[PDB]
């Protein structure tokens, strides 16, 4: 609540806190000896995302300023951003694998294999294009952890007088993460013009990640009604928050 630790730390301390809070890369139950259909490919992906959500929730507790918010606000922010955060993490892990998505260290998927699921083709191509963009920009891990934390705080802040100070506190942390991004680019030798341009390029990608998330949320609602891919109870509660 009072005396926010996030508002009284330098940029290099912001990077250290976010880097130390990174969740681990989880493995999949994928068996390469046995190929199977899209219903089982999605079964592996939904099982993986369910376990990833547990680490994401405890990762959000370690994001500066997130504990300062109320429980109702923490629930809202995660309910709206969880798929964006899974997607930017997936895109980050796939940077150094052109044309493929690294869902897990043992699950590196081609776009031809993702076409087994009806509708996953377009979402695969967008995630690939996002990964190709991060590779073009040479995205650094210090910038990725800043962007991922921006997604958590920003994606649900728009959806009484005391609540205005809560949204103002969220924008305070957002502005300080912006300072961290500019601090990082100044250290990399970029001019003031190059810092502002790269900052815009990074935040514009967040618009595409929201787009991928919205489209991805529509497909998850279709799998639930098709009732062919097993969906865990947490994923169903997160999916109900968007529909």
């Amino acid at each position: 609540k009072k005396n926010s630790l996030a508002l009284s730390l330098t940029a290099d301390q912001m990077v250290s806190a976010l880097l130390d809070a990174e969740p681990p890369i989880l493995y999949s139950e994928y068996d390469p000896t046995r190929p199977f259909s899209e219903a089982s490919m999605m079964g592996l992906l939904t099982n993986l995302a369910d376990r990833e959500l547990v680490h994401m929730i405890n990762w959000a507790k370690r994001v500066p300023g997130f504990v300062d918010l109320t429980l109702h606000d923490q629930v809202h922010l995660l309910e709206c951003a969880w798929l964006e955060i899974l997607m930017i993490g997936l895109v980050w892990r796939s940077m150094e694998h052109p044309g493929k998505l690294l869902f897990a260290p043992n699950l590196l998927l081609d776009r031809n294999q993702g076409k087994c699921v009806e509708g996953m083709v377009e979402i695969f191509d967008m995630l690939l294009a996002t990964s190709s963009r991060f590779r073009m920009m040479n995205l650094q891990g210090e910038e990725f952890v800043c962007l991922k934390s921006i997604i958590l705080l920003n994606s649900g802040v728009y959806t009484t007088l005391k609540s205005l100070e809560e949204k103002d506190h969220i924008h305070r942390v957002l502005d300080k993460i912006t300072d961290t991004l500019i601090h990082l680019m100044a250290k990399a030798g970029l001019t003031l013009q190059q810092q502002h341009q790269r900052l815009a390029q990074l935040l514009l990608i967040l618009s595409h990640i929201r787009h991928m998330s919205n489209k991805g949320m529509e497909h998850l609602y279709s799998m639930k009604c098709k009732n062919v891919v097993p969906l865990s109870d947490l994923l169903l509660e997160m999916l109900d928050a968007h529909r």
Partner: peptide, 10 residues
């Protein structure tokens, strides 16, 4: 909510 509880679990 499971998310409500997981955020509460400490």
């Amino acid at each position: 909510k499971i998310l409500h509880r997981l955020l509460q679990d400490s």
